Amino acid sequence: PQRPPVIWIGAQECTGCTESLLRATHPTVENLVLETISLEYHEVLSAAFGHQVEENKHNALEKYKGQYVLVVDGSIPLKDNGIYCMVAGEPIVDHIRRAAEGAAAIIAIGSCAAWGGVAAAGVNPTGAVGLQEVLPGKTIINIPGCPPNPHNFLATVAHIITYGKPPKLDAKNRPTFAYGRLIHEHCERRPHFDAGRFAKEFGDEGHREGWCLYHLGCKGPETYGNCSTLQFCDVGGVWPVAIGHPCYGCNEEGIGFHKGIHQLAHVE
Amino acid sequence: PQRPPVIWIGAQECTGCTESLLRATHPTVENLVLETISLEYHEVLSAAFGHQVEENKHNALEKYKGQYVLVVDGSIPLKDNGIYCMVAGEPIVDHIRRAAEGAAAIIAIGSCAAWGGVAAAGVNPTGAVGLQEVLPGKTIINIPGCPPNPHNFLATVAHIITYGKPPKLDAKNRPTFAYGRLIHEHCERRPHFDAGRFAKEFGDEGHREGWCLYHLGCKGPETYGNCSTLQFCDVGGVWPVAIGHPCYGCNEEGIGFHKGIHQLAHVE
Amino acid sequence: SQRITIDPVTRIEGHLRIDCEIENGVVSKAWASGTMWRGMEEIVKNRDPRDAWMIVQRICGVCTTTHAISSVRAAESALNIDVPVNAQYIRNIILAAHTTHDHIVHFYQLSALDWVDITSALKADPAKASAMLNGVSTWHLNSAEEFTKVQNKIKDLVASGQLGIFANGCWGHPAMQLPPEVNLIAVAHYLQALECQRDANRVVALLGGKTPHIQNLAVGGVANPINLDGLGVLNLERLMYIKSFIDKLSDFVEQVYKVDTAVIAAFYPEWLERGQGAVNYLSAPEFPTDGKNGSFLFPGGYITDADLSTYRPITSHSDEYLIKGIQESAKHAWYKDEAPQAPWEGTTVPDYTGWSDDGKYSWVKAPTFYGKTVEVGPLANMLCKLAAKRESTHAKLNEIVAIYTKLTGKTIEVAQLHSTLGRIIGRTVHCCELQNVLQDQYNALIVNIGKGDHTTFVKPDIPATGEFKGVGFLEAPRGMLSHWMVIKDGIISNYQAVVPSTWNSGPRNFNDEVGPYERSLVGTPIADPNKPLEVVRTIHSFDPCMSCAVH
Amino acid sequence: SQRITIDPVTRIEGHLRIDCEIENGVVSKAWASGTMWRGMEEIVKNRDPRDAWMIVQRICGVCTTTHAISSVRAAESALNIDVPVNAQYIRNIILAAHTTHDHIVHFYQLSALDWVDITSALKADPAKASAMLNGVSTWHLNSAEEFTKVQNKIKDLVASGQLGIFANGCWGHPAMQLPPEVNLIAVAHYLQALECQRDANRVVALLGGKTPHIQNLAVGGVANPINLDGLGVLNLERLMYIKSFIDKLSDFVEQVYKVDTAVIAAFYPEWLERGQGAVNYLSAPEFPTDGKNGSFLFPGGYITDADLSTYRPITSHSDEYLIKGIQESAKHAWYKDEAPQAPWEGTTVPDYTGWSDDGKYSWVKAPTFYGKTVEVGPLANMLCKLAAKRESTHAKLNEIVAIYTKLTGKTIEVAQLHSTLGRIIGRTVHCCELQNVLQDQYNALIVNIGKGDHTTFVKPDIPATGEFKGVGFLEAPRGMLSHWMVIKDGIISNYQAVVPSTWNSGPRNFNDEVGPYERSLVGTPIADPNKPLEVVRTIHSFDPCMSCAVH
Ligand code: SF4
Ligand code: SF4
Ligand code: F3S
Ligand code: F3S
Ligand SMILES: [Mg+2]
Numbered sequence A, B: 001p002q003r004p005p006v007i008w009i010g011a012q013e014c015t016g017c018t019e020s021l022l023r024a025t026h027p028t029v030e031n032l033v034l035e036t037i038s039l040e041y042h043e044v045l046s047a048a049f050g051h052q053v054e055e056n057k058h059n060a061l062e063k064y065k066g067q068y069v070l071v072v073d074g075s076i077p078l079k080d081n082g083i084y085c086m087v088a089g090e091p092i093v094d095h096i097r098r099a100a101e102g103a104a105a106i107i108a109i110g111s112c113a114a115w116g117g118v119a120a121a122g123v124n125p126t127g128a129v130g131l132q133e134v135l136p137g138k139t140i141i142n143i144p145g146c147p148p149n150p151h152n153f154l155a156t157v158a159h160i161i162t163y164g165k166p167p168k169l170d171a172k173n174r175p176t177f178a179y180g181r182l183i184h185e186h187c188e189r190r191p192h193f194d195a196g197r198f199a200k201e202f203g204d205e206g207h208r209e210g211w212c213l214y215h216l217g218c219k220g221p222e223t224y225g226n227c228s229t230l231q232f233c234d235v236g237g238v239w240p241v242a243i244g245h246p247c248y249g250c251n252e253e254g255i256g257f258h259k260g261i262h263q264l265a266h267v268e
Numbered sequence C, D: 001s002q003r004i005t006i007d008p009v010t011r012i013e014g015h016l017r018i019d020c021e022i023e024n025g026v027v028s029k030a031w032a033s034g035t036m037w038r039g040m041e042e043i044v045k046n047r048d049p050r051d052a053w054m055i056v057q058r059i060c061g062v063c064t065t066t067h068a069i070s071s072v073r074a075a076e077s078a079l080n081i082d083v084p085v086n087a088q089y090i091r092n093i094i095l096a097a098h099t100t101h102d103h104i105v106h107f108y109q110l111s112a113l114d115w116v117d118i119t120s121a122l123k124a125d126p127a128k129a130s131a132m133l134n135g136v137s138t139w140h141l142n143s144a145e146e147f148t149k150v151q152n153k154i155k156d157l158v159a160s161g162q163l164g165i166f167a168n169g170c171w172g173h174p175a176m177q178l179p180p181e182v183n184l185i186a187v188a189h190y191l192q193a194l195e196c197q198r199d200a201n202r203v204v205a206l207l208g209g210k211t212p213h214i215q216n217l218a219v220g221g222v223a224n225p226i227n228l229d230g231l232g233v234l235n236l237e238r239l240m241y242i243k244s245f246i247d248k249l250s251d252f253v254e255q256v257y258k259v260d261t262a263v264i265a266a267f268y269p270e271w272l273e274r275g276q277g278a279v280n281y282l283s284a285p286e287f288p289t290d291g292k293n294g295s296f297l298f299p300g301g302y303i304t305d306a307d308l309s310t311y312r313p314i315t316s317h318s319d320e321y322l323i324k325g326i327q328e329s330a331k332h333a334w335y336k337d338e339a340p341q342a343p344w345e346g347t348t349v350p351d352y353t354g355w356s357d358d359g360k361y362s363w364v365k366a367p368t369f370y371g372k373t374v375e376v377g378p379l380a381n382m383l384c385k386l387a388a389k390r391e392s393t394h395a396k397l398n399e400i401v402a403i404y405t406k407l408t409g410k411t412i413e414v415a416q417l418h419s420t421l422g423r424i425i426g427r428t429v430h431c432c433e434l435q436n437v438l439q440d441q442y443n444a445l446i447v448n449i450g451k452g453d454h455t456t457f458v459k460p461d462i463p464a465t466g467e468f469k470g471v472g473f474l475e476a477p478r479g480m481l482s483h484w485m486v487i488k489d490g491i492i493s494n495y496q497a498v499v500p501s502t503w504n505s506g507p508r509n510f511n512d513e514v515g516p517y518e519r520s521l522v523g524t525p526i527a528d529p530n531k532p533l534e535v536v537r538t539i540h541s542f543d544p545c546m547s548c549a550v551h
């Protein structure tokens, strides 16, 4: 059988979202590219470089027109006519809008593409914005996180492939299976919260008893995600709060990279 | 280099506790038996049978007198002078009392050996009792559950080997690292419990949103264990309530095998 | 007439005692004895019918899942419940994946060291061992370098003088016939099997909530909440995880386990010529795929007089012919009531009198089917499938025989399947065919969810008054299992389990006919009555489980 | 005369453009351009010093962990914090396990397809390929059967007509010199590598809380709670789990990765004679093992004139000699202030001017050490360790050389290490030695916890007024990393990162000396100017990361 085509474009990315694929187990990255999809364009992995790699994109854009899913990784810098991210001599926005026109679906992977992320934080030096702002006439599937659990992305494209449509989305176009609930509304330390059992400093008695981390600045109460349940890396018991550190709100616009680590959830 | 000796005795067991070792990953069984300990006696796995294997037991008992950890798996039937469990023509209670005399440490693995478990429930046809009742005046480490996560046992043994003493125990002699807290006081559905979001029947709306299982009979409120955190099988996200079914209380005496699945727990 | 006792028989589940009379170097008569009893049937009595499965699952943790599913099937039968098809898909996947772990562990961990000498493996040339597999298997872990690493682990084990559970095995026994090289091959495969069986149990865990002892069932269906778009429930992401482990099983089963089965046979051809347990065989059909508890993927039935032409198919778990024939007798077991009992009217009143060759000598009841003693298990289910002309089973058996032929120049007739090795071959065939039920049922579950069906549960209506009888059949790793529930006024008034190792390990019945284990031992040659490897070999072929047999 | 542009350079992290002038089929002059900028330095400005590490970790996700640890080390420097030794053990285990994953992925996933032709692998004889490795490696996954499975997967991929990431690569290019069999070998190892790197990251995950982007650090130590007897925290069970994955790393590293480095060298001997990037080398010492931020397992230092005898050891991250030498210049980069700046006084104000051969042409600053340009990374760290007469490094290098000599009968002198293959060799040696770092620190951690020390965090005292300067060094996978933080009145007034790929990919500096990528390319032969594989080969040897270089 012919495998569904995927075109991946990195803008202002740290490559964390690609790297997440390397931790995946269902599918593993090798099974992904050899069995479940055809990764037609991805600069981190591609044998071809320079002129040959751009040949590959234009070839895939035409051959698989109307059929590929377009994945954008990273924020898009709008300041100074797009010059803060230039590949093959053109602004990344240009590459992205051209690809978007032939796309069967469009996924913004990571908080940066989803809503600007870290690169759009603070004074936002480059005028970085999220994918939806760049592609306003198109519906964009947002899969935020810095980076998300890779399966939030993989199961989303699997749904499209297996069932011929995107998974159910919330108001911010995030798949409900991964982002439908606040981390706090499904967190295993909530009883400690209820009881007022709080860690005050790392290494204190409470902390060493696995108590709630609200007062270390946990942002679980205002961050939508599946970090407490799906967690990370498929080994069991691995997410930031479980290893001893508060949620930073990396999934969530206005929270991650805006609020201080130790700033409380109820403090703006 | 010499590996610490372990003698494993099965009384009224279902072999689930031995089987739990086959799911283990740190260490895997083969690493356990080749590298970590020397398993001096275990009927399910021993190459030798009958007279040969009883000789093996006798040899190890005197050779490693004062050094082996004794693991007992299963309840011990005291009714009718011990005849409901006979190996090599003798009551298992006798084998157990003999092996306990030269033990460096004694471990009751599984709820049966820890407090009587399933075999002692209802009318208790065989007068089955736990290891502590059979061995008064001996310190017994209880690792309850039916079966427990094998690492509840493995990390207990490893603590003994590495640090020369048992791990910290609670009032019922259960290791605090695995049994120190109610499941309900560290459960990820607690926010749903707090809010009044309950599954009322398998397959209903709440159930299919992963809401709290209290009203389906979850015994989380009255059982100590690490099922919600360590969970099972090291693949991530796998314990009974995560897959959609109430805790039954299999760890806790007077709970599992006594209360109905759908009977409600007392909440502290 | 020399008398030997083997107690305990190791590398089985639970507590088995085997006695033999030996005359002229050959066992002439045998006794099988289950030496531990718990009274599990009495323990579940007087509870809500919904509670039984969680309790009665604890009959055994080797064949975990098995009593659990048979228990809910029995309650469902009593209450006339049609199981939601999604719930069948889920039960099927769990059963098949569990059984793949079960069979692999039985062949390697429980059985291999009957036929394999580890001290001989020390003498092997790894390069020679690897080379003799060329064109025999495509397995990627048969290199000389793999075999050397395995060999060094054994060398190191030996060097420590702590052989542990490998100590004092039957190394050097005259009945050990493998060359040093294939001994090493088998040890390497023994170790590889542990990885495969763990993957099988990862599939079980993701649906069951853990294993040993799943916790995802209910009378009425399963407790898995199907919702592709739900957080914390059975969504596409979890389904993909389950599939990922299903895909890892087949290669080992096809390229190692299937191949080792024919190799063992090639070096032990007379074991195709002894070990016959019975002339009658029963299996239940298994893996229902409709919304009415039927449409099984695997057929079952009844064969008599070792004659496949007598095959009577059984295609329904409600077959009255099947239901009405089953009885158990305690004439030679330590129970009070001795006449044959239909399980719905069964009793289990302990009556220990100690050992008597002519009287009572086991805690195992002796089942019959319309008075006949029958062997159950993978040989029985293979024979039924063959007689049903199931092409898949013939094709799979023939694959094994072809390997045997390539190695020996000989073939294997259906007549030689009535033996210690045929029984082992039936189990390997079963394991191979289950890989396709895993693929099939996963895909069916995926497509059904796609059609919009997320139903997993039907709520049982248990009337507060009246009497209801139900029987749950299941074709377990070790054979046809059945749970028999009587409900009176909303509670369990009677509960009886008739378990496959009950059929096989049962003592002499009401007319003094020996059970399959006992029959299979007659004619077993004995080179050394102090080290009766040959009886342990035949007994293991039945995959004994004594917590199952006795409960 | 002839000018080519490679844009994008592929199989690296981030956005890199490389221009070359070609004379007589040989590149005569080169330009390296980082073409994407985010301004991560300005983004962290004006925040609590404790916030920095979570934010600047996002400079890069390929070399995750690195910017995080350097950032806390800089704040700790500013505040004179002695890091609890337990936090050191944990930081070290994370760094070493991450770097294992990182190097593996660089050799195979990022670099191998420069040297390996997949279409030639299809033509290979699997048995011949497997036989070639007899006596060369003891790896258990080099069987002809393994290689057949791999070949079939490539075969199926090409057959489908969707080559994906393998489409339109340099297949059949004249610089491809491996025979079919070695191509197949490398592809098999490429696939096997993916498992090993996953195992390395599971170590990282269990301590960091996830990867990419760990979340267990603090200014003052780590957020892991050590308590052997506690539920939900870092107990003995979690520690055993970590160890289980640590133990799974060394075999692939020693028996596969280390071996392949030599066989690539065997078929590409000239690549020991081109690609030299510099005559000066810098590395920081790494893996502190005491409670005063010192006692490093790995030594650092500075070498000039490609002469190991000039080696000036650096054994403290507080060494003023190291701190005083470092400056950066944007004379030829897209920033306003052009004169060399010390990082504490560093500025980063964008001045994009477009491309100019003689002017500005990159977002990467050009760093210098006492005015000199210097190569950083595994070649640098290996040379320093060799100059330090570190026995482990010489022995590990010698193991690689011996395999090469076994294959070629030739040898490799330290002079030949100043090259594209020498740089690759340095990376392999680093990965190899790091496996002993993992074991050492795991054990040190276990023994320290058993002494009763469970301290992991010292709270920082951050004065609400006053100025404080700190620098955090870290020997990253791609070379010496430094984060420079100025605190003024409780908040960050300046923040500058000088990243290893900044050193290597830097444009012409204030004295117009070219950067290491730029120098390395001069003299590279080009068989086809439209497909400059040879350039890509030398550039990849530096393991470029442009998010890192530019931030
Ligand atoms: S840790 Fe964070 S998410 Fe979990 S309960 Fe406390 S505050 Fe809520
Ligand atoms: S009742 Fe059971 S499910 Fe609900 S919160 Fe307590 S433990 Fe979790
Ligand atoms: S910081 Fe991010 S990864 Fe999850 S735990 Fe919080 S949303
Ligand atoms: S039934 Fe048992 S396994 Fe844990 S979830 Fe409840 S204690
Ligand atoms: Mg019964």
Ligand SMILES: [Mg+2]
Residues within 6 Å of the ligand: D041, D365, D496, D497, D498, D499, D551
């Ligand atoms: Mg900088």
